[model samples]
Target: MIPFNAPPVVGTELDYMQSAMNSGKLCGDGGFTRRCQQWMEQRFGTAKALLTPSCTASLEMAALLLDIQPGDEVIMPSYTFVSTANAFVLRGAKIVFVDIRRDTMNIDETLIEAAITDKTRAIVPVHYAGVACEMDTIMAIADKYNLFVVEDAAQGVMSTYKGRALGTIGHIGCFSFHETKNYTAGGEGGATLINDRTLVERAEIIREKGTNRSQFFRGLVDKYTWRDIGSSYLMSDLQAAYLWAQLEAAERINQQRLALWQNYYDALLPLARAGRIELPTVPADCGQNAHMFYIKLRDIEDRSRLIAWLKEAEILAVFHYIPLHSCPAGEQFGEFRGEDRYTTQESERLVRLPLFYNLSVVNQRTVINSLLSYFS
Candidate 1:
């Protein structure tokens, strides 16, 4: 059976891993780790980049940096990975779930302002499927409210909004390097893009388990000690080395994925025109990473049956996000900021197809053909 996604191998991973093994440093923030960080900074043009255990941890670090207080509110779309809300929730902040635009499945920038309360401290906009959110409007709302913004850019590597990289537009941003993501470094790896220069030293302290150990290593301190609340969120050198190899091949991987995205768009345009389904939409201002390919069915029932049919045909299709406002935890801890709107109803109708860096066009044809046959 064809899987939903498969990690790509760049041929140099083993060589890099072997080098890491021989270097006698398997811990975090070693040679390979620094190399990966530098590459991401240069490529993405962020003020700083620090590798982390996962995008989840990276957002948690952002929460720590913001010093979110209990009962403080964070506004975000319901149609996003749970990690987007969980980071702030973990800090005892109240989650204010908002609806999304039907086209992009991103937070509706217009609806954001009405949701703002005096307790609202931040706005977290997720770049779902690597399509940019309406960042300019979102940023305007953030500025008007004096709220911090964190872009949950897990699938947004190489994607941009209005020519600026996706993650860099916000105060702090997080990127995932999971197996299902554009790049891979085993099953767990991420980076925190530090745009606020003031947070750099403290972020390193947080990644180093709330100590001055990182500073001590750089000879800026005589001894390391606990300085703040933090955890061990760093990626191992082994993971970093593997990621270094992937980073080196990112452009090639990106082009391959874009080709697949374009192919899917072309093949499915007729079906979309007929109103059999809605195609993925990218705003003119957004340079999408082609990180995901998805379709929106007529309803939840149609989506369920279509996914089941795809599975029976050995084509693994999938769905995403249960709209945080409706989830058990979300229902308990969060409140909806606007009308039910399109958050729950629209997300339920959406299904993700198999699209990965290594996915071949032949296999893609099979998947598309099967989907087209469904509508026929």
Candidate 2:
């Protein structure tokens, strides 16, 4: 039986976790956490990187940094994890859900400008499946409107847009190290990438629960005090230790996943060409991290049928988001900004296959054959 996802393990996780344990500082901001932050900062070329408990926490921190007030609106795709909208909603900001491109399932950059209003405080572009939203156009729109761009790059670690890292292209970015992601911090983790240097100091303070504790630890402050609105968003050092192991093997993992991704594409190309289904599209300028590989069926009924068939074959495939605008909470705090277009239609037809680090070629072939058999 093939599972939907298996957390990546590089064999060094236990050793580093033990090291974190021995250091007597298993809390946040410990040596392991510092190492992870430094690695991301250098690798992503961001001004600062702060480890957080989860991608949700990283996004919440971004909203706080932006000071999203009541009645403010944040523009984003409805086809995203609830965290993308929940973070802003928690800050009393109304979410303005936009349509997504049918190809990448990313927010429709072309429609973002139309969604902007006087109350629009920010634009959160979720890089669905690690394929970037059109950052150049999005940034230009943000500049013209004086709105902040906070990238919800939860699935986009190691991905790039126009030669720039996905998370680093925006004023602020968030990454996930969840068990199902390309990397994992034990079971869950995340990081906040601060491209705008001015927010670096406050980001640190915010993650430390509105205090200047980070400064105090660096000997820059004699006594730490509450400096701003914040939360205990720091990732535990033990999780960072596990994450460091994964980060060290990031390249190998990326290559392996890419190869797997290509294998699926090659196997399914015939179906796509035959118009039996649609495959994902990564723009020439967007370097995706092989975060996910999904195929679009003829409709919701076909997707359900295929998923059930795959499950019967002991291969656990799955579907993605449910169009936030249709959800109860989203309806209460957010409104769909243009026509539904591809948001709901594309979402219903999409189904994610099993793809993860350490996914055996034999198992992948089984998944591929199972899919092909469905169409045949």
Candidate 3:
């Protein structure tokens, strides 16, 4: 059976993990953790990069750093994962979900201005399937309104928008290292990229249980004490060790996945040209990481049939998010700011194919053949 995703391994994860364990510092911010943080900080060009337990934690940390008070509204697309909205919702912020573009399954930049109000404090652009949203326009809007831009770049570790890394393009960026993502930190991990220099100090404080412990470690402070609100949000050093192996071979994994992505695109072109399905789009300015390769069927029924067919062949295919505004929690904590437009309908038509770093050419051909058979 072909699984939908397999966690990336570059042959050195266990060796690194063993080294981390032997170092006797298993907690966060140890040698391995520091190495991973420094690597991200250097590569992504952020003011600071802090590893956390999950992308959800990073988003929550962003909320705390931004001081999202009650009634402060956060604007985002309805098609994203729950974490994107939940982080702000936990801070008593009202989630204002907008529509997404059918072409990219991202927040429609043109509709964002109408959604903005005096209560709006930030605009979060989720980089869906590692494809960037219209950041320049989004940043311009944020600048005009004095609103923060937090990028939900969970699937965008190696992706870029106009040559700039996805996470670093916003005021704050959150990345996921889940098993399903392009990179993994031993099954679950994440990082928060701080771009605004002003928030660097508070971000550190907010990450360390609202204390000056980080400062104390750097000898900038005599003693550490509680200074603000926070909780434990660090990734264990062992997990960082596992992540380090992947980062070391990041380029290799990226190229391999891109090859797989192209194989699917080239094979399925006939189906897409025949108007039987729609393929994922990569704008000229965006450089994607090939985190996923999904297709949009004619409608929900066709999508369902395709999944069932693929399953019968012992292959797995899956769909993505349900519109958050329609969900129970979303109803309680958020509201759709504008017309639903393409969010729900587009999501229903989509189906993600098997994609991962280690997927072999033979297995890919099987998946491609299965897809072609179904379409035929």
Candidate 4:
């Protein structure tokens, strides 16, 4: 059976892990971790970059750095992973969910301004499937409102918007290195990109459990002590070592995935053209990492039928996020501002195909043929 995803392993993970083991520093902020952070800072051109245990941690750090207060509202799309909302929610912020563009399934930048109220403090634009959201418009709205923008760029490590890295465009960007993502830091890892330079010092303090430990390590502080509200969000050096291997070959991995993505798109074009299904779209301004390849069926019923059909053929296709606003926690923590519009409808109809680092051409053909057979 073809699985939906397989963690990326580029043959150098174990070697790196061994190196980390020999270095005698398995803790966070060691050589490997520093290397990973430096690599991100250099590549993304952020003011600073810090590795964390998960993207969720990176987001939480963003919320904390923003100093979100109770009753503060954060504008975001309903069609995103719960972590996108959860981070702000944990900081006592009310999530004001806006609608998504049907074309890219990303936050509709046009609708964001309407969702903003006096209490609005930040805007979190999720880069779904590594396809950048309408960032220019979103940034404009954020600037007009004097609000912070935290990019939920979990799937957008190698992706870009108008040539700028996805995470660096916003005030703060969070990236995931989970096993399912294009890169992995030994099964789970993440990074926070500090675009707004002012937040860099505070971000380090918050990530290091509210202490000046990072400064102490740099020999800038005489002695580290608790300085602010913080948490232990650092990633282990072992994980960083694993992640560095993937980062070293990021361009190659991205190209390979792009090739597979194009193959699926080309093969499935006939069905999309015939109006049997809708395919994902990447605008010219957006350079995507091809993190995923998905299609939209007519509706929930059609999606379910197609998923079952694919499963019967031993091909494991899957659905993405259920709109956060529709979930129990989402209903309690956030409210849908405008008409449900396309978020619910688009999410229900969407189905992801198997597109992973190691998915072979033969297996990819099998998946595509299975889809063609169903549509035919």
| All-Cα superposition RMSD per candidate | 1.1, 1.0, 0.7, 0.8
Candidate 1 residue 19 Cα shift, in angstroms, is 0.5
Taking the tens digit of each residue's C-alpha lDDT, what string does model 2 give over 1-376?
9998899989999999998899899988889988988988888899998899899999999999988999999998899999999899999999999999988999999999999999998999999999999999999999999999999999998899888888998999999989999999989899999998888888888888899997898998799998677799888999999999999999999999999999999999999999999999999999999999999999999999999999999999999999999999989999998799899889999999999989999999999999988999
Ranking the candidates on TM-score from highest down gives 3, 4, 2, 1
What are the lDDT scores of the predictions, listed in order?
Answer: 0.91, 0.92, 0.94, 0.93
- The whole-model C-alpha lDDT of candidate 1 against the native structure comes to 0.91
Point out the worst 10-residue segment of candidate 4 by lDDT: 35-44
Best by lDDT: 3
Q: Per-residue CA lDDT of candidate 4, range 38-144, in tens?
A: 88888889999899999999999999999999999999999999998989999999999999999999999889998989999999999999999989898899999
Error of 4 at 215 (Å): 1.9
Tens digits of lDDT, candidate 3, 240-315 = 9999999999899999999999999999999889988999999989999999999999899999999999999999
Scored against the true structure, residue 145 in model 1 reaches a CA lDDT of: 86
Look at candidate 4 and give me any clashing residue pairs. Answer: none
lDDT (C-alpha) at residue 9 in model 3: 78
Model 1 Cα shift for residue 86 (angstroms):
1.4
After TM-score superposition, the amount by which residue 258's alpha carbon in candidate 4 deviates from its true location, in angstroms, is 0.3
Clash pairs, candidate 2, are none
RMSD, candidate 1, Å: 1.1
Superposition error at 267 for model 2 (Å): 0.6
**TM per model?**
0.98, 0.98, 0.99, 0.99
Model 1 — which ten-residue stretch has the worst lDDT?
196-205
